[PDB]
């Protein structure tokens, strides 16, 4: 084997906001290209807990593994209410 | 060198469908009655598997028990992109 992979960490600094909403639209549409199934890898990523469940083709990886699967859970839940016409406070 | 498709196949008969959105709105009224965040306990419920995350006030704690966790969370998922513009099966 050959386990090249060095990050060099770029590091973003804190200033953008909504940020879950932009990986996990960058993540499911990574799994797109890939040819996997995003949501079946999405879900098992926040309840097992492990990066190796996005494919390292872009920085989605790294975009998703930099928030907590709590907070992305939480933000999931708050979205699937809000829009069902709940204003989450 | 475990190359095992697992579609489980396990598929309960349920002759509801978008249900789970209901029975979330249902968990989300509940906590309110009680004075608590909906979202801080349905993350919990979700990553952790634990019914106990629920409060006991209304039926929403044994509708949400009736579902399963990956369920209700690959919906959350879907969901989250679905009315974000995207559309998803």
Do not use: E, S, V
């Given at each position: 084997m050959g386990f090249t992979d060095e990050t060099v960490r770029f590091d973003f600094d804190d200033?953008?906001?909504?940020?879950i909403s932009e990986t996990l639209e960058t993540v499911y549409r990574a799994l797109e290209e890939k040819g996997y199934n995003p949501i079946n890898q999405i879900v098992g990523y926040l309840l097992s807990?492990?990066?190796?469940?996005?494919?390292?083709?872009?920085?989605a990886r790294n975009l998703i593994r930099r928030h907590e699967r709590d907070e992305i859970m939480e933000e999931l839940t708050k979205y699937y209410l809000a829009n069902h016409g709940i204003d989450i406070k």
């Open positions: 200033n953008r906001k909504k940020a807990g492990d990066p190796a469940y996005i494919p390292r083709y872009q920085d």
